[model samples]
Target chain A: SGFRKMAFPSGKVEGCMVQVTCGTTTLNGLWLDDVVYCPRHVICTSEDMLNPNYEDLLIRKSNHNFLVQAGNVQLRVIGHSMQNCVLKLKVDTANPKTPKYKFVRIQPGQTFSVLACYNGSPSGVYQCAMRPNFTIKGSFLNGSCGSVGFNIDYDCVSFCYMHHMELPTGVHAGTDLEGNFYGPFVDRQTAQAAGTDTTITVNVLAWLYAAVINGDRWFLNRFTTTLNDFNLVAMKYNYEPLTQDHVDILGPLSAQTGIAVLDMCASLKELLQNGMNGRTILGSALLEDEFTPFDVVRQCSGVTFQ
Target chain B: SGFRKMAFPSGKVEGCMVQVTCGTTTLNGLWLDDVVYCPRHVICTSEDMLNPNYEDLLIRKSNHNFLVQAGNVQLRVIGHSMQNCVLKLKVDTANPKTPKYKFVRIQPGQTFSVLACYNGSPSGVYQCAMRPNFTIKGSFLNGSCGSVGFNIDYDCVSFCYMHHMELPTGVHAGTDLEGNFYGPFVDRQTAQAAGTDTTITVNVLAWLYAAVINGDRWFLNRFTTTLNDFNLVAMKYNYEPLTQDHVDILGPLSAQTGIAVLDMCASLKELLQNGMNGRTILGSALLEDEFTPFDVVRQCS
Candidate 1:
């Protein structure tokens, strides 16, 4: 569940050096996505003691394994170190095969961290090893002389990678209704600072058709004049971007002039049928825009050819 | 702009009939929609009944006309005696010509009443005539005749027809954010009605390509597991229909997301960009839904 203290002691010596190397290996056949190891400095202490001590740490990578070195440090037998040791390391694989660990002792005053190198393997168990005496335990454990402690920390890494995703911004922009550009921003800072709402306006238009007696002079004359009247009426309703739904609703009445005119008279009835609700009636009247006129004309003259 | 009236005694029927017939000829070429005529009835006493008398009246087709005829009464005239006539009949004809009228004189003490008739050549004025003891002048000469002394009444007829477009009923049966049958219909009116208050729930799934390295196994493991903490935050708000105007406003913001999130740490910045009006906080607590193990693997792996 947590990590132990990691320390880097400083010392100077002739022909002395210190290094730390890190490497990754696939637990199974699965390959990991892109992974980067970020290191953190836990403690930085310089030597200031009556008895000067030499401490040199070296790290190297070979054949996918990491190597580390410290001067004059003897590996502590596993589970047999002083309570206040200078360094303690932990490793969390988060998989059943590779359980997480809290502390692993490398020497009497030093420790090395362990972590499962995942290559995108499925749920499975894994193994981790650490040297208690700062040296490889030959053959099996070589008795209890060089033992190390490796406690399991399960599901620890599962919640750690979430921080890697970049936070999403401007999500509020797509959700506002009022032309108010500042609206609905995820946070008040952006909401108040958002300058103006500028969104594209959509418009729709459509044509309605009707029939009249062809050769009846009286009927034709009235029809032509009435056609204009019908257009003007349609425009008054502001039926733009005429969708098929609008056509379905308004078509029958349109084709029948008698019904069309009557519908104008019964506009109130139609509104009632549609469950009219209380909302601001929008259009030129509220926006201070001038009204536009609509015009309609006959497709042909009232003449017949034999 | 009014009509004139003339009357004659039944004894002078022959002379009155001839004159009224001739007057109709003169007015035949005038334009008019209709004409009417009325005749007066006479009552006599037996003691002074040396001869019975009939009172005759004549009216024209161009004037406001009404008919008041009793049983067994006839108008020896053509083109008059119909009331409340419309003018549309006159303009519908193709040509103009003089209209014909017939005249007849009734015998003394005959006890007769007048009936009205209409006659006209298309596109021409109508002439009215009636004879035998009462001769009324045409509306053409006097500009007015047969005007009824009553209030004028007008009426209009209207017809309206509509069809009910049967839209499919029931709520929109599709999975939204909650995995329920979200509606295109609100209640039961129609899809339009239901869609009015309907909310569109959207969840955006995103991933980041990251590489882990080093014995830095600590950092790599933490980073790997942290991804599972990613969750979708459910935010509910009203949205207006997608209009061109709306797209114009939202289009740039949508496009800017790539730059804002990738180049500017915009996502993290957005998470932390909170204020008193509303505080923006970070950490996995902000997400409302936890990712399943399978989902996390699918996205990360």
Candidate 2:
């Protein structure tokens, strides 16, 4: 249903043609996914036809489906069992009927999709109630042996709403796979009530610090904003490219701030890792020992002006 | 001898006057160290005077000595105990005869200087041999009870000559102090012969890694050169000012390189700490397990 063509009112033989990378040869075809499918002869005099690497052509099948044997070879366009689509599959010593190696097109979107292949297991849809903010788009059969699923993960909270106080509680922060939440809750109420005896207060300061140290620029802006709101320091805008001002700010903060952010980040990683593995323990003292949540959210984020 | 003026023909009334941070208040004085001294009228109608902070003015006394009472105020030039230098000293609640508070002028030289005071101890000189490359310029009397010492620490090895294989042996890497050799040796032979029951091989790779993580840009260039020598990676030049190329290169290297550089730096810190306190141990396997000396130099370092 997602496949259609641009036809004129007169239906004057409307179609498409794609030029090969190596030669003047062009393949007449129809649209399939993001690629062109040539029902005509796929002839090219250039070495591009026998490309041993990821050539500069992007193609896929319709409805984000696993490409068929004719679609086995990733082309700029897939042919509906067209002559050129089959001919495009002719090179690389692949079986003219069904090529073994399958290439999945990684598309641009808000989701992260991973393809898994097993030798003999029958293809079946497995639903993983993805993390709270994720939604499964669809599933595709990777032949009778394997399958692939697609899903999208998006932010559940807006940046402006992420204040140190009034933090969101009862929200599930887990990996992509659906499972029992054991750690990383904004409050102890949510953790204790999550149908388990395991409960530990997640260090919001450490979480904020971890995200910034992990190169999350979006989180850094919020951190700086928190510091500025308290008059602890002026707003910093030159963090992206790392200017002298940025170095100047970080240098003094590094010397003055008592929080060993590196150690805190490691502790956060272990907490998350244990959560993923379905085992939770009391978070380390290193996370919350240096400064209180209010302190980190205020004066601790930046240096006081000399 | 280091305080003579840049006098022209016949020493035409040669002397110096330093401009204060405020208005056209210039203090006439003699050359001391890097600061100008005014022995004349020291008048500045700006907030720069009574400045309760380190202003933009940089000055010092002669031979890197501790500033005296006239020098105590830290003028741009030291007067021969002149009037303006005295006036520059005026305003501050400090006793004009001998200011109780002392401000030693830190100079741009090779040595690190520290001023120490005891409640009641004679201002006598104490010599600490300093790390191998350090040289004590001189010592200055802080008061009846205090004294200041200055020394410079410079590199003992050239970066280009710092090959992993032929690391300088027996060279003292201790901090600027009169201490026996303990840790951070390039060879076991030197360490074993240093008259200590402690000897352990230093991890060259971890040393290289630590220097880079410490933001030593000069060391980074040498490290990148080492990486290129082994064809493990290509030359990376856009490190300073940090360009996209530098990020791209470091990203893959971070992902590919298995060396947990952070942990190794911690271990190195412990080794040096123990050595400074006069003790040694077979360094943690974390330093040497991942890579050998030759590996670090030819392929690791």
Candidate 3:
């Protein structure tokens, strides 16, 4: 079969395939070979995986629903869902697998927080995912390991990404596996070359704040109801992905709900070490005490926001 | 300086790791060369990552903890244990990293369930985890995100893998992950070339069953008094990894257990496709409907 082909705006043809490197949306430095992505990691572009103006039945139950505090740097997913949602977080958008988060079944009126941060990083470009989970509100393995009371059901269609009530708005800290703190860079290269604060709070809020500038289809796929267990085809259908609507819903429930945030930083400290061997050598004692709650407002001395 | 060396059964070198290929209690073919396991994955083996005859403080908590109903698959974890306990599930024993599963903490007297499945398989090897969170009842991040009363504490030293109430005690099912339904053939040319099922249950229990036959150090690492979550050291502590004491301890409470199982096949149908753009164009429509409760048994017959 004789077929005609066309070259891309900016690309080179290698022996077996075409290699494109245009600095745009569709092709963001990642090659366009026979694979969907680079098989390793696609490029990291400013691709907001959500539709800006799209709305959903998500009504912020209160101001207590912001997923992050003002100045926190922890890796976590704590919020309230406006629907029986399943949120999936892929730390690496290119290579899909665990360590990233496939959080599921966050129901409405439910304030759930799923956080983790082990002492490690991926060997690929960094990208994550967050989509409402719409699957069985129960377990995922009923095959042979069925002798324990593991089946449970979940139902809720609304939640809020609230801030914690106690902690102040200050985020700073790095994490490691056995030890408490050490490295916070994605890779040695990005850690050294970029000097970017790739902490949990930094990455989570990076997209959270992107919304302030990404009204132009900022997030990825939209929402839907046909999601199987944990909603494999996950995404924010209508409401926002990172930061949903309403920081004021708490006016009716509790007048003091406006400034709550999840303990993203504190959560990351232990969440990442979920499976390490060791007893509670120490509990609250292991927590890295923040001497002073420094406001990010100070860091934003000359920063401007829309 | 004098350096000594030991030669494993099938390994290439003499000083690093045992070259194990007896193909006995565990899934063979899956390897341990530079790669964590055979790239393609070998036939899922009965290699329970836990130790065998693990006589921990694990007590028969009753038959109230089984994790599923007949023919039902959901995401959850259920087992028996002693006073304090923590269950561990490795996302992948070989490729240590994120995405596989870092699931931890399932305490005694507490029934917790954690599950995950993508649109399909990850571009990488297949493996996922679910767990019942029982340890540390208090919120680890009690500092903030504290309200909603999510305060829990975790403490304990023993655990036991239990048996379910009914159904065949037999275990089979090619886990695209633990069993390597598709990847099993990889080990011999990788499970892809050999063929095997490595579902967590099959793999986990493969060893569990192998223990009935391998009372001799069947499990992996020894149990520790300080396993923070589900002993992630990923091994059989002194006792047997799969069945510690009595399916009695692990089984007692499992009898009263209800519906619970990982939604593996279902979740995969969509999990593999995480980022596809579209509309509310089609949902509820994609769901498989069931008007009546028809067991896999009924469907099977």
Best by lDDT: 2
- Pick by DockQ: 1 or 3, better one: 3
- Give candidate 2 misplaced runs (Cα > 4 Å): A1-217, A220-306, B1-20, B23-301
How do the candidates rank by lDDT, highest first?
2, 1, 3
Q: What CA RMSD would candidate 1 show? A: 45.0
TM-score, candidate 3, is 0.17
lDDT of 3 by residue, A1-306 (tens): 000010010001111111112123111111111111111111123332122111131231222222211112222222222211111111112322111122132222221211111111101010011122211111111110100000011111111111111101111121111112122222111222212221222222222222222121222222212113111211211222222222222122112222122222122223333411222111111211111011111111211110
What is the CAPRI rating of model 2's predicted complex?
incorrect
User: Which 10 consecutive positions of candidate 3 chain B have the poorest summed lDDT?
Assistant: B1-10
Error of 1 at B154 (Å): 59
lDDT (10s digit) by residue, model 2, range A49-120: 344122223232222222222222344222322221222222222222221112222211112222211221
DockQ, per-model, please? 0.00, 0.01, 0.02
Better of 1 and 2 by lDDT: 2
Evaluated at residue A20, the lDDT of candidate 3 is 18
Q: Please, what are the lDDT tens digits per residue for candidate 2 over residues B84-175?
A: 11222222222222211122322111122222112111111112112222222122211111122322112111000000111222212211
Q: Which of candidates 1 and 3 is the stronger one according to lDDT?
A: 1
Off by over 4 Å in 3: A1-192, A196-306, B1-301
Question: Per-residue lDDT of A1-306 in model 1, one digit per residue for the tens?
Answer: 000011100000000111223232111110011111111111112221222221222122122232222223211211111111122222122112222212222211112111111221111111111111112111110011111111212112111110000112211111111111112222111212223321100111111111111111111112222334434443455422222343345444356444343333233223323422322121100111111001011111111000
